[PDB]
Amino acid sequence: THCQENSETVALCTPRIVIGNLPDGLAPGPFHELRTWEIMEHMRLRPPP
């Protein structure tokens, strides 16, 4: 991102420490639901309690 400073503009960078940070235009909301279903399937909790 570009950021504001006193009478100045500067560039800023930061680490996307969780995958959730990706914009939902590139990683849509339903994609996380299906991936969570896949996590539960791998752990054999597919029908949750």
And the tokens for 38?
């896949």
1 binds other proteins (CB under 8 A): no
DSSP string computed for 7-45: TEEEE------SGGGS-TTTS-HHHHHHHHHHHHHHTT-
7 binds other proteins (CB under 8 A): yes
Which one of 8, 16, 17, 23 is in contact with other proteins (CB under 8 A)? 8
- Cβ proximity to other proteins: between 3 and 17 the closer is 3
Binding site for other proteins (CB under 8 A): 4, 7-9
